[PDB]
């Protein structure tokens, strides 16, 4: 389990999780606030 | 003695080596110091020969890898069936195949991408799919979304079984090397069980499920009203109502009175006129014959009993005066080198995929397929590309064998040796014939361009000026069309409409008509011959000179993949066989792009179109326009690019976006192909200085990509760009004019 | 060692190559030139007549084709002369190659004129 | 002929000599390094300029240098 | 010059590790021209981490 | 050690004949002749492509360029533990021995070799290209 | 070479162009560069490149030399 | 070449929309690259590529031929740009073998030994073909579109 957490701490897995979080956050913001251009 | 041989518990299942990147390589297990390491880690991840010298461990690794691939493919099939059941218009399409467009992908309503869900009919909105799954599913007799859902669950379960099989046969019970080396037994089991029992069980499903359901679908009864398949197995009286042969049961089979099975095992030929596909009775007879043939073929090699042939004995028996020892040593080569096997299997698997493309366009096997012009173009093009890639791969792994596994002290005056020993003659003759083909094939086009530009059309190579008729192909075509009358008496029609004859139309569209070959067809076929010969030249030169040349006498010691041997001796860039694969990749792209252009223009000009006479999609301009480059430039690319360039504001807008994106990626590749890593390393030096100034220089040192990686990135973005460009062009064109 | 093939080491091939006029080793370079020219101009007169730009006009197709064949024979004789001027500074000498090129000019023009006189 | 030079940073590791595919370099007695060995290039007329020696040299910077010069039939690696 | 294990700073201008810091392995006491063996925790483009230097090319910093 | 002589009457390895052998350079300019003595009959790899059987005793091959003889020397020296020497032969008949020109192989030091092409300075101690402008030719600053 | 280039432009305009006809109405008349002699042509090409007002096939110049020469005083 | 191609695409399309009368077309379509590819390159090359066709020819056939000529020289430059030396050196060595072994053509021999082009020469020849094709393609397109539509 320690080795599995080290594997999850490796670089492409963290890039995948972090870009999934960032893309989902932007997707959620563009859903609930549709089409923002200003402010 | 053929038997099961297995080692118990060789490799422990543990997450430890997941947490140590590059564990498999003694060099890469030291850790990263520069950025090059990462790329190496992914490049050498699956090169199992460079991991261990033990053929057994390598063989086990490739076995479990193959299981992983099969599990991935099963996940993919599961996905296609599930999306076909849950997010499609398949039932509506079943109720009206001629006026509903097959769609099995829907997009979510965010950031305006909702427009991609277009009006495909059936009260549905989505992206029209061109994989041909709907026609496959109707041909298999599927009628409801529930059956597709159950197929999805089944394929997912099978994927879990494949990944368990991988884990099991690597970590728990891993086969021994003498298990893997039982190639005679492997051929017997694969020819009998795989191909033989495969086509036998499929013919079983066809005869018992496909034929009645599709006979009712062609009769016109509502799919929901059609009896479920299990009722067809259960009550043989219904089977006897549709085909009275089934009343007598399996008595004519065992009593050898097979003529009474003529209701569902036919030899009609042609296409089903109300449906535009091959007769499923012909397909059932075909799979029964194929089954019996392969089950006969699978009992050829000796295993644990005296009967049966021996592969090494058949090889060592064929020796002549011209070739010396002949096929001696080839058995030893093909039972110890995975790369040789991969070369052979890739060559025939690619060639087979190209044959699949041609035979599936020419003899449409699925119902309502020939008139789904987008599906036909997509399938032909796709399988042609897959084919070409596998051929280039064959050349690659042939060369990899030549460098790593070739050992002449078991291979001394042999077929392979003599080929190596007269390679200069081989390459020089191939060289000359490539230049000859290039000059006369391309020169006719340049000649025509010049004459047309100079206002002298009577001096061109065309059907009205200096004619160059494909007399041989026309003769073969005529013979094929006249074959049912004399040389195939039991055939009611020719095997394909393209030989000649009448015209089969479905829903006002042309399914297939006779294809005529003239001067333009002569010219494109010799262009094809030229490009194929050049690709063969590059790849074959790569494999024959992989070990040595007059330039690099000891090239074998430098490996398969290496940048060069320095700027000396005039310059030795791209001397490696890998670099020959790299150039062969570009030439393969060239060849197959002209092939799919030939197919697209010829079908839209002389075959497809609506029936009122037939009004073709491009009016029949091929015969007069396909003799000049300006003709291809204007009447094909420029003319048919209208749909892609004006696809904005509609559901096809994604094809415009991917048109532009693909152009961009193609161009982006030119930086890697045209430049070199010295410049980039120095640029990175300046940038590293800037990062050092602000205490943000990484501990893993930024390095420019290697020479070979620059070439690899280059050719990959080049192929992706060009192929995706033609993809967007093709799909937008054929969907809007289809 | 050199690879053995029927093509490079056949006796009929050796006799045919020894009988062709570029090999006899004791005939004059003028004679070799006029024989090679009588062969090559006679074969070269054909495709200009049959496929040239005036091929569909009567009585002038053969004239224009033979005239273009004579022009190409003149270009080939100039090529032979400059090849000899570059290479050599009995057939493989400066005087011998100049004799051979003049013989090729004469024999090629004679071969074109005999392919017309037809 | 290509210009091949040896510089006094040589540590006599013999790597360049065993990397040259042409037998151009050799090791001579010397006193400037602990190995008491120095490289030397007495046969640069047969040098093609492949720079395997430069790839094999460990010192930073290089102790063997190949300056590509005028080409001959031996330096172009021609067999014809 | 500097003793074993001490940190120096390289001032040979064409070195890869010029204006940077390494660690002394040994200093040879013969008439060798470049006796100071310095190891570096990062590799050059050749993948080498060790180089000989002179007494006036290293500064104990 | 004395400089050995070429014996042209030395038996050659068993070889069926490649298309990658000699050309007109061997007849006009030079070709090279490699000679070794084997301990047993054994198959090796020809540098021009193909396989060949070396004889038991004196062997003799002839190649076009020098790197072919070096490649066969490296193969016979690292794979078979043999000691070959290859010569340079002209169409005059002039025979030029080399490798090992000292008799001892160049990968080890031998007393008596004169050091050639040795700059007694660093590479960073070279002059600038302004200091070598307008000589009789193109010069690099490392030439002086 | 530059002055021979300029003298050649002047000579080919003066012999094969329409400068004296261009200066009468330089809005509707195209500036001829030089005449075409190409024996590889056909009669449709000769008729097509024979634009006007010229005898045979011409090229229409896009180098501005008629405008420059007319402004600096050539007539 | 990229930068001057950008500045002259921009110059030419803004002036074509000034000369036709609809500067609104440039002001609307200039803000997106599909508007570029559709309304400049696809649109203004309609009379260029109709310079010759199977119905006849007209005065723009020299510019259609030169347009294809520039595309061809550009493409030929890509060969020297992508493929490098040692491939061609091995190919030329097999050609040297074939010529020296062919009977009745080995009576003719070269004075200069044939070798593949060097690395620097290859870069120069590829950049030269690339540049000449670039120049001829845009010259043919610009002259033919402006002269055919005005
Ligand atoms: C690099 C140039 C560039 C710029 C300046 C923009 C800018 C924008 N894009 Mg565009 N876009 C771009 C490239 C760019 N994009 C590319 C390359 C693509 C193709 C992949 C797109 C495809 C695209 C789509 C499909 C859409 C946009 C949209 C937008 C708007 C998003 C506003 C937002 O996300 O909410 C605000 C976001 C936040 C507040 C998140 C930040 C969180 C921090 C904590 C805020 C801190 C503030 C203090 C914004 C004007 C959306 C739009 O409607 O345009 C009008 C939209 O639907 N873009
Ligand atoms: C799930 C339980 C499990 C665990 C803990 C292990 C553990 C191990 N395996 Mg085993 N094995 C398993 C199941 C497991 N295996 C399965 C299911 C298979 C069949 C594929 C195998 C077949 C197998 C082989 C052939 C080998 C191993 C090896 C190993 C050892 C090292 C491998 C490693 O660290 O890389 C961890 C690997 C990864 C994290 C990558 C997973 C790759 C999958 C297939 C990717 C598929 C993704 C797909 C392509 C989607 C991509 C989309 C797009 C982004 C491209 C380690 C002890 C190796 C060994 O023992 O060497 C001495 C070895 O050679 N295993
Ligand atoms: C696409 C199909 C595919 C298949 C069948 C494999 C199979 C394998 N990969 Mg590979 N891999 C792939 C794609 C694939 N890979 C791709 C596209 C890349 C990026 C280039 C890699 C990068 C990669 C690395 C760096 C390594 C592997 C390794 C392996 C082996 C160990 C996998 C394992 O034990 O985990 C078992 C898998 C599971 C238990 C299920 C997967 C679950 C994960 C978390 C998702 C196995 C033979 C390892 C190896 O070769 O060891 C010698 C290894 O170190 N792969
Ligand atoms: C008649 C029995 C039989 C059948 C049907 C197969 C079928 C296959 N083998 Mg073969 N194999 C067999 C006997 C058989 N084998 C024997 C006796 C040997 C030893 C001489 C081998 C040695 C061998 C090797 C080394 C490899 C194969 C591989 C394959 C697969 C090729 C991929 C493909 O295109 O299939 C299409 C895919 C399908 C038809 C999917 C259905 C597959 C299921 C599992 C049915 C196949 C029957 C299977 C043998 C039963 C296993 C039961 C198990 C619980 C004990 C295919 C599934 C390759 C592979 O991919 O490994 C994973 C491979 O590398 N086989
Ligand atoms: C040999 C190759 C082959 C292939 C590729 C197929 C493929 C298919 N069959 Mg067919 N079938 C075959 C042989 C084959 N069959 C033979 C030889 C017979 C004669 C017995 C049948 C009799 C048959 C029937 C009666 C039906 C199919 C159906 C199907 C389709 C859905 C099955 C599925 O994916 O769910 C995966 C399968 C399961 C999840 C099984 C679930 C349990 C069921 C109820 C079976 C219970 C009894 C059984 C012995 C276990 C699928 C296209 C179904 C269909 O869609 O028809 C339109 C269907 O109803 N097949
Ligand atoms: C290869 C695949 C395949 C399969 C699976 C079938 C299957 C079938 N066909 Mg056939 N058929 C096929 C190919 C196939 N066909 C081909 C290629 C042709 C063309 C020649 C035909 C032509 C044909 C005709 C004309 C007819 C059939 C019929 C049948 C059905 C009955 C046959 C029979 O009596 O078998 C013999 C019986 C068995 C094999 C018994 C099976 C063994 C049992 C299940 C073992 C159970 C043991 C276990 C211990 C007990 C269970 C315990 C458990 C409950 C706990 C059966 C569904 C008949 C039918 O019903 O039509 C609708 C029929 O009239 N077929
Ligand atoms: C337009 C683009 C283009 C063209 C024309 C060429 C042309 C050629 N390639 Mg190249 N190639 C290209 C792109 C191109 N390539 C690119 C982009 C790459 C990078 C991947 C390569 C990489 C590559 C490889 C790896 C190989 C080739 C080879 C060849 C030659 C094939 C032999 C032949 O067909 O001779 C016939 C000549 C032609 C088809 C050229 C047109 C000739 C015209 C029609 C007639 C000429 C007469 C002329 C008009 C008279 C001029 C007179 C005037 C001077 C006064 C041919 C010269 C191959 C080779 O040389 O082996 C034989 C080979 O192996 N190329
Ligand atoms: C490359 C392929 C190719 C081919 C086959 C042709 C063919 C032709 N051209 Mg075209 N042309 C080409 C490329 C080609 N061209 C290119 C690239 C351009 C642009 C530069 C042109 C520009 C052009 C113009 C401007 C004209 C032509 C014309 C012609 C026609 C007359 C030519 C002629 O009379 O030559 C003379 C014939 C020969 C020199 C024959 C030599 C070749 C022989 C037959 C080879 C035989 C080898 C033999 C089999 C070996 C046997 C060995 C054994 C005995 C031992 C002819 C149909 C003319 C025309 O009007 O046509 C209607 C014409 O005016 N061409
Ligand atoms: C390198 C290639 C090149 C080429 C092919 C051209 C081509 C052209 N230029 Mg351009 N030009 C170039 C580079 C080039 N230019 C450069 C590098 C500059 C910046 C210096 C210019 C600046 C330029 C201007 C400002 C103009 C041109 C113009 C032209 C066009 C008219 C032809 C011409 O120049 O007449 C040949 C010119 C001469 C032979 C010299 C003219 C007289 C000189 C200036 C003074 C003579 C003094 C006299 C001898 C002194 C007597 C003293 C007295 C006391 C005795 C032609 C398209 C003209 C144009 O566009 O017209 C439509 C135009 O107005 N060019
Ligand atoms: C014709 C070729 C006959 C070939 C043929 O009949 O070979 C037959 C000949 C028979 O050899 P043996 O009878 O000694 O072979 C015995 C065993 O080795 C094979 O069972 O094989 C050779 O001698 C090799 C010579 C290859 C010569 C290569 C010529 C290649 C020409 C390529 C042109 C192809 C054009 C058409 C392609 C579709």
PDB file of N, CA and C in Angstrom, chain B residues 83-122:
ATOM      1  N   UNK B  83     -22.453   1.677 -26.254  1.00  0.00           N
ATOM      2  CA  UNK B  83     -22.862   2.951 -26.820  1.00  0.00           C
ATOM      3  C   UNK B  83     -23.907   2.738 -27.917  1.00  0.00           C
ATOM      4  N   UNK B  84     -23.844   1.594 -28.602  1.00  0.00           N
ATOM      5  CA  UNK B  84     -24.839   1.247 -29.600  1.00  0.00           C
ATOM      6  C   UNK B  84     -26.177   0.926 -28.997  1.00  0.00           C
ATOM      7  N   UNK B  85     -26.191   0.497 -27.736  1.00  0.00           N
ATOM      8  CA  UNK B  85     -27.433   0.145 -27.062  1.00  0.00           C
ATOM      9  C   UNK B  85     -28.034   1.354 -26.354  1.00  0.00           C
ATOM     10  N   UNK B  86     -27.207   2.147 -25.688  1.00  0.00           N
ATOM     11  CA  UNK B  86     -27.682   3.217 -24.825  1.00  0.00           C
ATOM     12  C   UNK B  86     -27.704   4.575 -25.501  1.00  0.00           C
ATOM     13  N   UNK B  87     -26.715   4.881 -26.336  1.00  0.00           N
ATOM     14  CA  UNK B  87     -26.638   6.205 -26.929  1.00  0.00           C
ATOM     15  C   UNK B  87     -26.680   6.127 -28.441  1.00  0.00           C
ATOM     16  N   UNK B  88     -27.715   5.511 -29.000  1.00  0.00           N
ATOM     17  CA  UNK B  88     -27.789   5.377 -30.443  1.00  0.00           C
ATOM     18  C   UNK B  88     -29.243   5.423 -30.894  1.00  0.00           C
ATOM     19  N   UNK B  89     -29.430   5.332 -32.203  1.00  0.00           N
ATOM     20  CA  UNK B  89     -30.730   5.293 -32.858  1.00  0.00           C
ATOM     21  C   UNK B  89     -30.885   4.016 -33.677  1.00  0.00           C
ATOM     22  N   UNK B  90     -30.336   2.915 -33.145  1.00  0.00           N
ATOM     23  CA  UNK B  90     -30.224   1.658 -33.880  1.00  0.00           C
ATOM     24  C   UNK B  90     -31.584   1.055 -34.226  1.00  0.00           C
ATOM     25  N   UNK B  91     -32.531   1.059 -33.281  1.00  0.00           N
ATOM     26  CA  UNK B  91     -33.861   0.508 -33.549  1.00  0.00           C
ATOM     27  C   UNK B  91     -34.600   1.306 -34.621  1.00  0.00           C
ATOM     28  N   UNK B  92     -34.616   2.638 -34.484  1.00  0.00           N
ATOM     29  CA  UNK B  92     -35.192   3.515 -35.504  1.00  0.00           C
ATOM     30  C   UNK B  92     -34.569   3.247 -36.868  1.00  0.00           C
ATOM     31  N   UNK B  93     -33.238   3.090 -36.891  1.00  0.00           N
ATOM     32  CA  UNK B  93     -32.523   2.760 -38.119  1.00  0.00           C
ATOM     33  C   UNK B  93     -32.976   1.420 -38.679  1.00  0.00           C
ATOM     34  N   UNK B  94     -33.210   0.439 -37.804  1.00  0.00           N
ATOM     35  CA  UNK B  94     -33.727  -0.853 -38.244  1.00  0.00           C
ATOM     36  C   UNK B  94     -35.080  -0.699 -38.911  1.00  0.00           C
ATOM     37  N   UNK B  95     -35.919   0.174 -38.359  1.00  0.00           N
ATOM     38  CA  UNK B  95     -37.234   0.402 -38.936  1.00  0.00           C
ATOM     39  C   UNK B  95     -37.179   1.189 -40.241  1.00  0.00           C
ATOM     40  N   UNK B  96     -36.120   1.965 -40.485  1.00  0.00           N
ATOM     41  CA  UNK B  96     -35.989   2.727 -41.732  1.00  0.00           C
ATOM     42  C   UNK B  96     -34.517   2.906 -42.088  1.00  0.00           C
ATOM     43  N   UNK B  97     -33.892   1.886 -42.690  1.00  0.00           N
ATOM     44  CA  UNK B  97     -32.451   1.988 -42.989  1.00  0.00           C
ATOM     45  C   UNK B  97     -32.097   2.969 -44.094  1.00  0.00           C
ATOM     46  N   UNK B  98     -33.004   3.232 -45.032  1.00  0.00           N
ATOM     47  CA  UNK B  98     -32.661   4.054 -46.185  1.00  0.00           C
ATOM     48  C   UNK B  98     -32.745   5.549 -45.909  1.00  0.00           C
ATOM     49  N   UNK B  99     -33.429   5.969 -44.842  1.00  0.00           N
ATOM     50  CA  UNK B  99     -33.573   7.395 -44.578  1.00  0.00           C
ATOM     51  C   UNK B  99     -33.219   7.776 -43.147  1.00  0.00           C
ATOM     52  N   UNK B 100     -32.476   6.940 -42.428  1.00  0.00           N
ATOM     53  CA  UNK B 100     -31.995   7.302 -41.102  1.00  0.00           C
ATOM     54  C   UNK B 100     -30.495   7.067 -41.107  1.00  0.00           C
ATOM     55  N   UNK B 101     -29.767   8.034 -40.674  1.00  0.00           N
ATOM     56  CA  UNK B 101     -28.317   7.975 -40.626  1.00  0.00           C
ATOM     57  C   UNK B 101     -27.820   7.371 -39.316  1.00  0.00           C
ATOM     58  N   UNK B 102     -26.973   6.345 -39.399  1.00  0.00           N
ATOM     59  CA  UNK B 102     -26.450   5.658 -38.206  1.00  0.00           C
ATOM     60  C   UNK B 102     -25.654   6.581 -37.298  1.00  0.00           C
ATOM     61  N   UNK B 103     -26.087   6.689 -36.044  1.00  0.00           N
ATOM     62  CA  UNK B 103     -25.427   7.546 -35.069  1.00  0.00           C
ATOM     63  C   UNK B 103     -25.368   6.826 -33.734  1.00  0.00           C
ATOM     64  N   UNK B 104     -24.186   6.831 -33.114  1.00  0.00           N
ATOM     65  CA  UNK B 104     -24.007   6.177 -31.825  1.00  0.00           C
ATOM     66  C   UNK B 104     -23.072   6.957 -30.906  1.00  0.00           C
ATOM     67  N   UNK B 105     -23.000   8.274 -31.065  1.00  0.00           N
ATOM     68  CA  UNK B 105     -22.231   9.124 -30.165  1.00  0.00           C
ATOM     69  C   UNK B 105     -23.010  10.415 -29.983  1.00  0.00           C
ATOM     70  N   UNK B 106     -23.167  10.844 -28.730  1.00  0.00           N
ATOM     71  CA  UNK B 106     -23.867  12.076 -28.394  1.00  0.00           C
ATOM     72  C   UNK B 106     -22.935  12.908 -27.531  1.00  0.00           C
ATOM     73  N   UNK B 107     -23.011  14.225 -27.681  1.00  0.00           N
ATOM     74  CA  UNK B 107     -22.172  15.124 -26.907  1.00  0.00           C
ATOM     75  C   UNK B 107     -23.043  15.823 -25.875  1.00  0.00           C
ATOM     76  N   UNK B 108     -22.424  16.218 -24.793  1.00  0.00           N
ATOM     77  CA  UNK B 108     -23.085  16.944 -23.725  1.00  0.00           C
ATOM     78  C   UNK B 108     -23.270  18.422 -24.080  1.00  0.00           C
ATOM     79  N   UNK B 109     -24.311  19.072 -23.541  1.00  0.00           N
ATOM     80  CA  UNK B 109     -24.552  20.500 -23.852  1.00  0.00           C
ATOM     81  C   UNK B 109     -23.714  21.368 -22.914  1.00  0.00           C
ATOM     82  N   UNK B 110     -22.458  21.556 -23.312  1.00  0.00           N
ATOM     83  CA  UNK B 110     -21.565  22.539 -22.717  1.00  0.00           C
ATOM     84  C   UNK B 110     -20.827  23.260 -23.840  1.00  0.00           C
ATOM     85  N   UNK B 111     -20.261  24.436 -23.502  1.00  0.00           N
ATOM     86  CA  UNK B 111     -19.488  25.396 -24.314  1.00  0.00           C
ATOM     87  C   UNK B 111     -19.834  25.523 -25.802  1.00  0.00           C
ATOM     88  N   UNK B 112     -21.047  25.130 -26.173  1.00  0.00           N
ATOM     89  CA  UNK B 112     -21.585  25.230 -27.505  1.00  0.00           C
ATOM     90  C   UNK B 112     -21.352  24.024 -28.377  1.00  0.00           C
ATOM     91  N   UNK B 113     -20.657  22.991 -27.877  1.00  0.00           N
ATOM     92  CA  UNK B 113     -20.341  21.795 -28.659  1.00  0.00           C
ATOM     93  C   UNK B 113     -21.582  20.956 -28.958  1.00  0.00           C
ATOM     94  N   UNK B 114     -22.719  21.297 -28.334  1.00  0.00           N
ATOM     95  CA  UNK B 114     -24.031  20.687 -28.545  1.00  0.00           C
ATOM     96  C   UNK B 114     -24.477  20.681 -30.002  1.00  0.00           C
ATOM     97  N   UNK B 115     -23.982  21.626 -30.809  1.00  0.00           N
ATOM     98  CA  UNK B 115     -24.314  21.734 -32.230  1.00  0.00           C
ATOM     99  C   UNK B 115     -23.883  20.487 -33.004  1.00  0.00           C
ATOM    100  N   UNK B 116     -22.899  19.745 -32.489  1.00  0.00           N
ATOM    101  CA  UNK B 116     -22.406  18.532 -33.125  1.00  0.00           C
ATOM    102  C   UNK B 116     -23.453  17.427 -33.150  1.00  0.00           C
ATOM    103  N   UNK B 117     -24.425  17.472 -32.242  1.00  0.00           N
ATOM    104  CA  UNK B 117     -25.559  16.564 -32.264  1.00  0.00           C
ATOM    105  C   UNK B 117     -26.518  16.964 -33.376  1.00  0.00           C
ATOM    106  N   UNK B 118     -26.337  16.397 -34.565  1.00  0.00           N
ATOM    107  CA  UNK B 118     -27.123  16.809 -35.706  1.00  0.00           C
ATOM    108  C   UNK B 118     -28.354  15.952 -35.911  1.00  0.00           C
ATOM    109  N   UNK B 119     -29.161  16.359 -36.880  1.00  0.00           N
ATOM    110  CA  UNK B 119     -30.408  15.681 -37.226  1.00  0.00           C
ATOM    111  C   UNK B 119     -30.114  14.433 -38.048  1.00  0.00           C
ATOM    112  N   UNK B 120     -29.932  13.305 -37.354  1.00  0.00           N
ATOM    113  CA  UNK B 120     -29.637  12.042 -38.021  1.00  0.00           C
ATOM    114  C   UNK B 120     -30.884  11.230 -38.335  1.00  0.00           C
ATOM    115  N   UNK B 121     -32.048  11.680 -37.899  1.00  0.00           N
ATOM    116  CA  UNK B 121     -33.311  11.009 -38.126  1.00  0.00           C
ATOM    117  C   UNK B 121     -33.685  10.147 -36.940  1.00  0.00           C
ATOM    118  N   UNK B 122     -34.871   9.548 -37.034  1.00  0.00           N
ATOM    119  CA  UNK B 122     -35.348   8.683 -35.971  1.00  0.00           C
ATOM    120  C   UNK B 122     -35.648   9.378 -34.663  1.00  0.00           C
TER     121      UNK B 122
END
